[PDB]
Amino acid sequence: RVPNYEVSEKAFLLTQSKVSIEQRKEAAEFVLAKIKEEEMAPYYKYLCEEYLVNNGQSDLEHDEKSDSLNEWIKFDQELYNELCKKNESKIKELNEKIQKLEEDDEGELEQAQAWINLGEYYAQIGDKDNAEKTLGKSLSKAISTGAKIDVMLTIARLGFFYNDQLYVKEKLEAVNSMIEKGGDWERRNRYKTYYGIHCLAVRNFKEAAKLLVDSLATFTSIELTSYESIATYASVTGLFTLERTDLKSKVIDSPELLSLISTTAALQSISSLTISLYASDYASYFPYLLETYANVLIPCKYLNRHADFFVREMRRKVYAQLLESYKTLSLKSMASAFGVSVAFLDNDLGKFIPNKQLNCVIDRVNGIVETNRPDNKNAQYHLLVKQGDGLLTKLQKYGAAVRLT
Amino acid sequence: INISNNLQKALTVKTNDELMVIYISNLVRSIIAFDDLIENKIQNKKIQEQ
Amino acid sequence: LSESDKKSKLISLYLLNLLSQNNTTKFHSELQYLDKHIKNLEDDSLLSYPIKLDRWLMEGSYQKAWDLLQSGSQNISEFDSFTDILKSAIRDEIAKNTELSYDFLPLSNIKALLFFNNEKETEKFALERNWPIVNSKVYFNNQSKEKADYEDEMMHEEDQKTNIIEKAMDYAISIEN
Amino acid sequence: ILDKIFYGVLDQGNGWLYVYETPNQDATYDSALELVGQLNKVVDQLFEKASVLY
Amino acid sequence: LHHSEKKYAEEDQVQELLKVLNEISKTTLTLDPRYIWRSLKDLSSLRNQELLNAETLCFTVNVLYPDSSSFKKNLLKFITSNHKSSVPGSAELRNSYPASFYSVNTEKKTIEVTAEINCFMHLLVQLFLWDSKELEQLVEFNRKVVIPNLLCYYNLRSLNLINAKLWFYIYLSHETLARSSEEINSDNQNIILRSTMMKFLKIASLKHDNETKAMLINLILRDFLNNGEVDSASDFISKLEYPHTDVSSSLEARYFFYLSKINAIQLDYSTANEYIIAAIRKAPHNSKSLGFLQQSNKLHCCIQLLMGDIPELSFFHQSNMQKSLLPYYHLTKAVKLGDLKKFTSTITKYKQLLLKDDTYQLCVRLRSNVIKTGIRIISLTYKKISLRDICLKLNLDSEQTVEYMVSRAIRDGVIEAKINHEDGFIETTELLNIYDSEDPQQVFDERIKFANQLHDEYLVSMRYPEDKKTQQNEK
Amino acid sequence: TTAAPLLALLRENQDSVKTYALESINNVVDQLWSEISNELPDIEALYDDDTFSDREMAALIASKVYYNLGE
Amino acid sequence: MSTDVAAAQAQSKIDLTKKKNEEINKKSLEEDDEFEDFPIDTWANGETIKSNAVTQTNIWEENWDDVEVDDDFTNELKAELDRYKRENQ
């Protein structure tokens, strides 16, 4: 249960070469200890592939790059020997138990509990395919509705290990069927988070916030990642979705976050960023924003691909907030608050304005920054005509097809 | 002008619903018409025989 | 026997005639049809001259366009009968575009843009074209008002713009058939 | 302004404060976004029924 | 052995023959033989291809022949002679049978039945060649005959429908021959090809058959488009006779493609948008139609760039078209970011790929559109900006060079600005808020005219299948 | 073969070349109909004139062209 | 994929016996699928797949961050650079 994600989390951080020197070498230690002790032997061969062009590599049976920036990476032959031994052993033991459960009738509850143990071993060693097969026999013998739901979650978890978002998605359709058959609120919370993490793994965060702000209140955890880890993810999803008034309630005034405090780096930076967006201290906003890039977005698996998008958005919001409270600004005032140069400021605005969330122009000549307001009845007219343009396209499109019939 | 435009588009959707449904009934009445022909053969015949 | 020494020169001259009359519509159609006889088989060797000019006019570099004409008089084949006309074509195109841009340009700024060699020609051209120079400022707005006044003078006119009354009468009768 | 207790804009290039209490919202327009919304969902439901025709 | 196989192909055909045949000698029922003819072609391709290649000669002996058996022997002779079990009493299935014309009745006197069977036979020849993938001599020979055959006689309503497909095969083989290889001959036959179809369109107007007319226009239009004659296509389409009466959705897809393309080079992009957006949707959406569909997608984006509008980056990404839509993505990106240096490298690099799809002449014109996007950004981002700063940003030559670009551009309303000459800047004039203007009324009326079109379009078509279906007998 | 000379020849000045334009035009006009539909006034000019005796031929061209037109 | 919603027009149009002939006729006009040339010229394609993962090979929602690089690195330098100038002004 416990190494299955924790080894993957550190192993992802270790892969990157776009992390800090220090953070990669701390991770590397946790990964390596856990291969030898827990018998993560096949996923360890797998992980030598996953760098490749990224550095660190120093393996004895698998490729190396010219630049080893790590040495808490080693392949040993003892690892391979062990595999062979341990494999046969676990397999032999349980098998015989299964045959014994066949001789004297006991096989409904106990043979499925034996096959649950077989998929956990299979899962331990990093085989999604053969874990799933064993977890398949568990179903066929007739068991409680509770047990059946617990098993499907485990299988979907093996999807996260190889960081395959589609493998997660497909399995979690089946849980949606059984969830109301058991009718539990306990395994529904697990569902909320399981989904939480899956929605966080894909681009769109709108669903994520909703599931994960709830997952602060009541959490039940069977092969689901730590409560400080879940808190961090929730602050990210809050920021994205919500605006001032709402935001302030949800993720600053939660009793749950306020009792958990900050003690670790990741939680700390994310938390301080969130108060500064609300409180209009824009000075201290950019040091927190930069900390958020290194310590929060990138070592995370479910935000490595959404890190670029999240920071870019953040720059858009904070400047856009400022703009809502202004009709005119000066270039220097605006630049000073951020703690950048006027030249540099024009440059960052000039990527963001065409696409537009800022709703501003800059008069370079009078030395002001001017703010245009299309919010009136004009705004509401533009909203409707566009939504209507689509209805007209669809009506046309289906209609030509039936008129042809 | 604006509520007249929105209401004009709304009636287009109800009428195009009706468009499809006439076309679904035709498909079913086709099946019925084919079985009918075997039955009409016996009906034509009875009139010749008597 | 489907080409000549003369042909390559001939296509160069026809392409200039379309440009000089400002039938740009037929200039592109004709080039499409022309393409597969001159692609690399006669190639562009003399044909460069209306082609490059064209590239500069599409881009809107009236400057690069002027230079290709100016250097275009050193090499004579007989293209000077259409270069002289294309010199004029440019001025009118510039003249139309600058009405929108501004109301006024000093006399000196007009000479440089609209390509003259005498300040007295610049002033004469303006008078004939219906811009009064009063106080050494041109009034581009004059001609524009006069053209516009003329469109309102002729009548076709009530339906094309469409009255409020007319829009609402059209709705009710579409329904009621 | 951000709280929206007078929702105005401060113009810093003249130092003048405009207070705007104006409605920038109208009922018809908001209800219209929902009405259109409804029809888009309906037209997906219609499309399934026409699948038989194809 | 051989005989067995020949009897089976013949038997299979007889069935197919019956379907279309029984209807047409009742009286013409134009629409219904047409739909069957579409199914019939597909089954015949498999029939001909397998179980030897001498089945066509046999099928001929089974039906009546004045000169039909003779003509068919010459076709077969070329691809090595056949006449074994292909002569009466061993390719003869009649012998007092009435569907295939009673033998007594055939000997006895006059009135022809040659008409429909002759026409049908020709169709089978076309298909026979096309499966083989030999054109050359056989095609030239077959071509010569069938044209004076259709005009000897005067066609029926049904007989029109068979030539509307027949011509498609004569057109296409000749295009492939002409594009193989260049000769003095290649130029000669092009002339003949245009002459026959265009006269045949005159006839077909008066006979009342829409399907012959619809196919002919497509073919003729493709012909101008190939040979780069913009001038010939512009006249054809302005002296309209295209039907929207009875066509396939196949035919509307071809027509709308040729129209969009032609219009593009002659500097009208707006109506071309309507035509190409229309064409894709009318075309059947399938994996065997992927050739025609793939060509339309490439054109459409290229046409969006010509307007100065930008089609989706989303478009190139989620497609399963990605391989072929490899050049366009960069062509859009180059224009979107408004860097002219990128655009010059792109159109060089993909020069071979684009030339095939013949958007290459359009890529040259898009260089205008680059500049347009690049100054559009500058005006939107900085309202008031000196020409000096625009030179820095986009590497223009001088103050003047950019002045002229804007000046030309705002006549067309692209940048939508006004220049301040004396103060040395460009001051942008967009400011929105036209809910004070009377502007919504025109906009709204164009939407109400689309909604009115949809209203007319349902009303006519709905009852029409219903009235036929009620008329036909039912329980 | 292509209608472009036949257009040029009516516009060419000399009586003999104008008579020639008519004769070429009428022989192939079911290939070449479109283009001479546009250039119809020159054809009506020749009809008018009693300084040609191929005036009849020019009224004849106009009847073929119209047939192909749809008018 | 194609104009409009590509998903809305794929189910509107599917195979019938009438339709199958017309698919072949359309294909054969240009000839082939026109989708064999790109694999031959390049002899195994080499697309834009390196820049990020919202590139040409993408199967998830686009983030629109392939038209622009990561400016966060740049910003680390810009922030520090400002502090130093500011300090002695």
- Choose from G16, G75, G86 for mutation: most chain A CBs within 10 A: G75
Strand order in the sheet with D9-11: A368-370, A326-330, D9-11, D16-18
In whole angstroms, give the CA distance from residue C50 to residue C16: 6
Residues of D in contact with G5 (CB under 8 A): none
Other beta carbons within 10 Å of E22: 11
Provide the β-strand partners of residue E420.
E425
Cβ distance E452 to C24 less than 8 Å, yes or no, reads no
Burial per residue of C129-143, b for 16 or more beta-carbon CB atoms within 10 angstroms, e otherwise: eebebeeeebbbebb
- Measuring CA to CA, which residue among A117, A132, A118, A211 is closest to residue A164? A132
What gap in Å lies between CA E404 and CA E415, rounded to an integer?
A: 13
E186/E182 Cα distance (integer angstroms): 6
- The SS3 call for residue E157 is helix
Q: Which of E441, E451, E462 sits opposite B18 (nearest CB)?
A: E462
Q: For tokens 């929060």, name the residue.
A: A296
**C-beta separation of B13 from D46 below 8 A:** yes
Distance CA A341, CA G86 (A): 10
Task: Write out the two tokens for E84.
Answer: 């074994």
Residue E384, φ and ψ in degrees, nearest 5 = -120, 115
Q: Please name the residues in contact with C14: beta carbons below 8 A apart, sequence gap of 6 or more.
A: C30
Spatial contact of E191 and F32, defined as CB atoms under 8 Å apart? no
| Residue G85 CB neighbours (<10 A) | 9
Pairing, β A368-370 against β D9-11: unpaired
DSSP letter at A370 equals: E
Solving technique: cryo-EM
Q: Find where tokens 């400016």 sit.
A: G71
Structure-block tokens of residue F56? 């009849």
G and B touch per CB criterion (3+ pairs under 8 A): no
Burial class (CB in 10 A: 0-12, 13-18, 19+), E209: buried
Hey, are the CB atoms on E41 and G21 less than 8 Å from each other? yes
Tell me, what amino acid is at E277? I
Please give the structure tokens belonging to residue A162.
């190889």
Dig out the tokens for E169 from the structure: 């095969």
Q: What are the residues whose beta carbons fall under 8 Å from the beta carbon of C84, sequence distance 6 or more?
A: none
Q: Which of B1, B4, B6, B11 should we substitute to test contact with D (largest number of D Cβ atoms within 10 Å)? A: B6
The distance in angstroms from the start CA to the end CA of chain D is 56
CA A221 to chain centre: 17
- In eight-state DSSP terms, residue C71 is G
Contact E253, E291 (CB under 8 A): no
Indicate the resolution in Å: 4.5
Q: How many CB atoms lie within 10 A of CB G54?
A: 22
* B17·D53 Cβ contact <8 A: no
Task: Report chain F's terminal Cα–Cα distance, integer Å.
Answer: 25
Q: Which of F25, A76, A398, F67 is closest to E198 using CA atoms?
A: F67
* B17/D46 Cβ within 8 A: yes
User: Among A206, A211, A176, which residue's Cα sits nearest to residue A193?
Assistant: A211
Residues 323-362 of A with CB under 8 A from D: 324-330, 333
Secondary structure class of E207 (helix, strand, coil)? helix
Round to whole Å and give the CA distance between F29 and E192.
Answer: 13
C169: CB partners within 8 A, 6+ apart:
none
Q: Which residues of D touch A (CB under 8 A)?
A: 1-2, 9-14, 18, 24-26, 29-30, 32-33, 36-37, 39-40, 43, 46-47, 50, 53-54
Contact F21, F33 (CB under 8 A): no
State the smallest CA–CA distance between residue G28 and chain E in angstroms: 8
CA E366 to chain centroid, in Å, comes to 26
Written in H, E and C, the secondary structure of chain E is CHHHHHHHHHHHHHHHHHHHHHHHCCCCCCHHHHHHHHHHHHHHHHHHHCCCCCHHHHHHHHCCCCCHHHHHHHHHHHCCCCCCCCCCCCCCCCCCCCCCCCHHHHHHCCCCCHHHHHHHHHHHHHHHHHHHCCCHHHHHHHHHHHHHHHHHCCCCHHHHHHHHHHHHHHHHHHHHHHHHCCCHHHHHHHHHHHHHHHHHHHHHHHHCCHHHHHHHHHHHHHHHHHCCCHHHHHHHHHCCCCCCCCCCHHHHHHHHHHHHHHHHHCCCCHHHHHHHHHHHHHCCCCCCCHHHHHHHHHHHHHHHHHHCCCCCCHHHHCCCCCCCCHHHHHHHHHHHCCCHHHHHHHHHHCHHHHHHHCCHHHHHHHHHHHHHHHHHHHHHHCCEECHHHHHHHHCCCCHHHHHHHHHHHCCCCCCCEEEECCCCEEEECCCCCCCCCCCHHHHHHHHHHHHHHHHHHHHHHHHHHHHHHHHCCCC
- Residue A51 to residue A29: CA distance in whole angstroms: 17
Mutate to test the interface with D, among B1, B12, B17 (most CBs of D within 10 A): B17
Is there a contact between E465 and B26 if contact means CB atoms under 8 Å apart?
A: yes
Residues of E in contact with B9 (CB under 8 A): 447, 451
User: How far apart, in whole angstroms, are the C-alpha atoms of residue G36 and residue E323?
Assistant: 9
Q: How far is CA A159 from CA A4, A112, E376, in A?
A: 11, 22, 46
Distance CA G52, CA A304 (A): 11
Nearest CA in chain G to D53: G12
Range 390-449 of E in CB contact (< 8 A) with B: 440-441, 444-445, 447-448
Q: Which chains touch G (3 or more CB pairs under 8 A)?
A: A, D, E
- What residues pair up with E450 in beta bridges, in sequence order? none
- At how many degrees (to 10) do helices A110-124 and A145-161 cross? 10
What lies within 8 Å, CB to CB, of A67 at 6+ separation is A55
Q: State which residue of chain D sits closest to G14, comparing Cα positions.
A: D54
Q: Do chains A and E touch (3 or more CB pairs under 8 A)?
A: yes
Adjacent-strand bridge partners of E428: E417
Whether residues A368 and D13 touch (CB distance < 8 A) is answered with: yes
Q: Are A121 and A90 in contact (CB under 8 A)?
A: yes
Chain B contacts to A (CB-CB under 8 A): 5-6, 9, 12-13, 16, 19-20, 23
CB contact under 8 A, G13 and D51: no
Residues 6+ away with beta carbon under 8 Å from E156: E28, E115, E116
G2 with E297: Cβ contact below 8 A: yes
CB of F33 within 8 Å of a chain E CB? The answer is yes
- Considering CB atoms only, which of A392, A395, A405 is closest to B16? A395
In degrees rounded to 5, what are phi and psi of residue B30? -65, -45
Give me the phi and psi of E417, to 5 degrees please.
-140, 180
Name the burial class of residue E182, with classes exposed (0-12), middle (13-18) and buried (19+) by CB atoms within 10 angstroms of its CB: exposed
Looking up tokens 């038209």 gives G67
Element (H, E) at G66: none
Spatial distance between the Cα atoms of A67 and G62, rounded to a whole number of angstroms: 33
Q: From chain A, pick out residues whose CB is under 8 angstroms from the CB of B16.
A: 395, 398-399
Which helix (H) or strand (E) segment is D11 a member of? strand D9-11
Residue C27 tokens read as 């200039």
**Cα separation of E17 and F67, whole Å?**
38
Report residue F52 as tokens. 């040609």
Residues 6+ apart with CB under 8 A from C18: C24, C26, C27, C30
CA dist., res. A305 & res. A321, Å (int): 26
CB contact under 8 A, D9 and A390: no
Which residues lie below 8 Å from residue E421, measured CB to CB, with a gap of 6+?
C101, C102, C104, C105, C109
* Partner G contacted by D40 (CB < 8 A): no
Asked if the C-beta of G89 comes within 8 angstroms of chain D's C-beta atoms, the answer is no
E203 vs C151: CA distance, rounded Å: 47
CA atoms of D45 and E144, how far apart (whole Å): 56
On whether the CB atoms of residues A21 and A300 are closer than 8 A, the answer is no
Query: Closest Cα to residue E300, out of E342, E336, E264?
Result: E264
- Chain E residues contacting F, CB < 8 Å? 191, 194-195, 198-199, 202, 205, 232, 235-236, 239, 241
> Which of E284, E292, E318 is nearest residue G30 as measured by Cβ atoms?
E292
Whole-number Å distance between alpha carbons of G35 and G45: 12
- List, in order, residues 6 or more apart from D48 with CB less than 8 Å away: none
Q: How far apart are CA A333 and CA A349, in angstroms?
A: 15
Q: What is the CA radius of gyration of chain C?
A: 23
Tokens standing for residue A292 = 């958020």
Please name which of A378, A350, A360 lies closest in space to residue A323, comparing C-alpha atoms.
A360
Q: State whether G19 and E321 contact (CB < 8 Å).
A: no
